[PDB]
Amino acid sequence: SHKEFTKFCYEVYNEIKISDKEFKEKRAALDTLRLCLKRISPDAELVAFGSLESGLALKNSDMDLCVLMDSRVQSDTIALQFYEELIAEGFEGKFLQRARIPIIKLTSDTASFQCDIGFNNRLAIHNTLLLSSYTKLDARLKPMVLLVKHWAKRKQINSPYFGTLSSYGYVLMVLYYLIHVIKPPVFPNLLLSPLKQEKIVDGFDVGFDDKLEDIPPSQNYSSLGSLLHGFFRFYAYKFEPREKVVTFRRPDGYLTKQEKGWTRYILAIEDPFEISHNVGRTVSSSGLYRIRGEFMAASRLLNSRSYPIPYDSLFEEA
Ligand SMILES: Nc1ncnc2c1ncn2[C@@H]1O[C@H](COP(=O)(O)OP(=O)(O)OP(=O)(O)O)C[C@H]1O
């Protein structure tokens, strides 16, 4: 059904997606950051990943960048040189190193410009390649993702530091639903494709079928509204968070926490490429309770027999 909800979903979609204005400003910011990188290292290369790159950006979007360079170069050395140029060129931020990983976090621009810079973070590039490819495979993914991220933020269930889930996690929960749950599938599993060639980067297989022009279109013709209602329905009522693991490495999407050795693991989502990383590791016990509760409320709302049926409340701050 869901005809007026679809129309509603597209209306909200258009108000929340990054404007061309902002996209173009972010892209100018990246060009500026590249010239600073040139000035101190000619061979190093500054790449974008996540939201802006994959086209899943809300308004007021943060920026995820990665410096690529020769692995035989010490990454802290050029990281500090790059940091020193950024201060000098007028950006404000922090230089930190977590374990062996040097990071630059920019916060302003002498209001707020917010942008992270990783060094040789080759795996994030691939994570974004996968999601970029899926975005190009079916036009319904992008608005679906943006609405789910919008909903998660309004429900205070999108805070990794406070026991809930990252946006990337929610994206994977969407993809997982569209690949291994909905029937017919909205997408195939590009990682398990017969056509997939292996590609090892930093010890993980990041290969997937990227011959995108060869794939038959989805045989699922559900409106954006049905998909969304399906998605909320599945995580509210059907998915089992204590036993099961969100995965992209099984043909049938079945994976138990025990096989994986994942008895923190209150919510378990196996990264598609870094399969040793639980994307939902930040999820606390109280976090998960609020996440499920919101999933259920979303379902209850979209079932509602009332008139007027208040779809707006889907995005009211909980
Ligand atoms: N929890 C995580 N574990 C491993 N990698 C992550 C995690 N969160 C983010 N990343 C990496 O950074 C990329 C996107 O990060 P993130 O900002 O959470 O999502 P997003 O697409 O930017 O949504 P936003 O609009 O930024 O909230 C994807 C992945 O390579």
Ligand SMILES: [Mg+2]
């Ligand atoms: Mg981001």
